[PDB]
Design a protein around this ligand. Structure first.
Ligand code: WBA
Ligand code: CA
Ligand code: CA
Ligand code: ZN
Length: 368
């Protein structure tokens, strides 16, 4: 039936700024929050302001040296850290900005807090749109990500769940999460992403895990222009097979919105309905579920996507006509919630989609 939803947000998150021209805009989280508030979605969920995750909480995954670096570096002292900046990949993509550490603490706090709430059986779903920073590694920032809130949240879920399923619908391969759990069967990672001359370069169909983790990493490589139809040919059949074989007791779903049509950095052609159908499919299994954010660079579409996915989590129908809100002008010229796909060519033929699905089904037959 209808599920209980806990939503994590800190009103300060929208004030963090990556710098002039940087495509990552934390303000998109504030736009999402304001839109879902104006739709009245606050009357149906418990809203929490997560704590600032401590350096000690972050070192459950990250190295002590890397976390100490993040907690020490500032724009005014950067010149003294040129050596560590190179070592930790802090530079162009992952710049030093005012409040960087606090931004990491809030993004991480929401994911860990949601995982604790699910562990305590006090909610069916927990949502942290400021999380989903799948590219961060043990001792390295990457792809606009510094602290891997997902890995930390999964480590929290593993305290009470034998098997945790991680699903990632961001356009980019979920590399940091896949690497963290590559040699264990206690987490299955499933990533659907653009593959081929594309960041971060990993996520080949043939990357299936190693040691005890062999067959517990699943990668669905895609070409430009995937549409709702192509994604629909494979998402439910693959997730259904994974649920059947793996039988997880908790699920983490990364909902990166850079897989939407019209994204500034992405090259996919999903609509908000197509992207949200993934949330509907996963939610249907009725398992404890942590929903996280991720990429997304056409910020009016990110706000639409995550507002609609919050309504999907709540089983709440909302009108296509947008309510008035603090960012109303960003949603012109139509002022509607849903988006139309572009005319871009879908390079993922129906035959290619079925063929990759069949190769993944062969690997899933290898689970015990
Ligand atoms: O291609 C490389 N970088 C990629 C990284 C894209 C990472 C995407 N991350 C997410 O989508 C993501 C996610 O999936 C989940 C959670 C959070 C996330 F952020 C890149 N695309 C564009 C730029 C860009 C453009 C303009 C700039 C202007 C000012 C300063 C820096 C700018 C950076 N950077 C390379 C690096 N080193 C060698 S090649
Ligand atoms: Ca992905
Ligand atoms: Ca694994
Ligand atoms: Zn991304």
């Amino acid at each position: 039936g209808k599920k209980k939803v806990c939503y994590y947000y800190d009103g300060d998150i929208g004030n963090y700024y990556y710098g002039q021209g940087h495509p990552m805009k934390p303000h998109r989280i504030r736009m999402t929050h304001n839109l879902l508030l104006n739709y009245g979605l606050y009357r149906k969920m418990e809203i929490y302001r997560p704590h600032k995750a401590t350096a000690e909480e972050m070192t459950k995954y990250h190295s002590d040296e890397y976390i100490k670096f993040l907690r020490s570096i500032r724009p005014d002292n950067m010149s003294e850290y040129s050596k560590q900046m190179q070592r930790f990949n802090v530079g162009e993509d992952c710049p030093v900005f005012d409040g960087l550490f606090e931004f990491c603490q809030l993004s991480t706090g929401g994911s860990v807090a949601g995982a604790v709430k699910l562990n305590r059986q006090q909610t069916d779903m927990a949502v942290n749109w400021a999380g989903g920073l799948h590219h961060a590694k043990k001792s390295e920032a990457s792809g606009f990500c510094y602290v891997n809130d997902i890995v930390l949240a999964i480590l929290e879920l593993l305290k009470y769940h034998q098997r945790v399923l991680y699903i990632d619908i961001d356009i980019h391969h979920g590399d940091g999460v896949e690497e963290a759990f590559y040699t264990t069967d206690r987490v299955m990672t499933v990533s659907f992403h653009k593959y081929g001359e594309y960041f971060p370069g990993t996520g080949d169909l043939r990357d299936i895990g190693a040691g005890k983790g062999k067959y517990y990493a699943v990668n669905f490589p895609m070409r430009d222009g995937i549409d709702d139809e192509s994604y629909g040919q494979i998402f439910k059949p693959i997730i259904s097979k994974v649920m059947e074989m793996y039988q997880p007791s908790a699920v983490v779903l990364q909902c990166g919105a850079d897989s939407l049509s019209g994204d500034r950095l992405g090259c996919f052609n999903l609509t908000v309905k197509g992207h949200a159908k993934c949330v509907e499919v996963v939610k249907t299994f009725n398992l404890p579920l942590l929903m996280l954010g991720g990429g997304g660079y056409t910020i009016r579409n990110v706000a639409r996507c995550w507002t609609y996915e919050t309504a999907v989590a709540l089983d709440c129908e909302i009108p296509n006509e947008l309510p008035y809100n603090d960012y109303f002008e960003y949603f012109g010229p139509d002022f509607k919630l849903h988006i139309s796909p572009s005319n871009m060519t879908n390079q993922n033929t129906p035959e290619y989609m079925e063929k990759i699905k069949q190769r993944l089904f062969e690997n899933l037959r290898m689970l015990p």
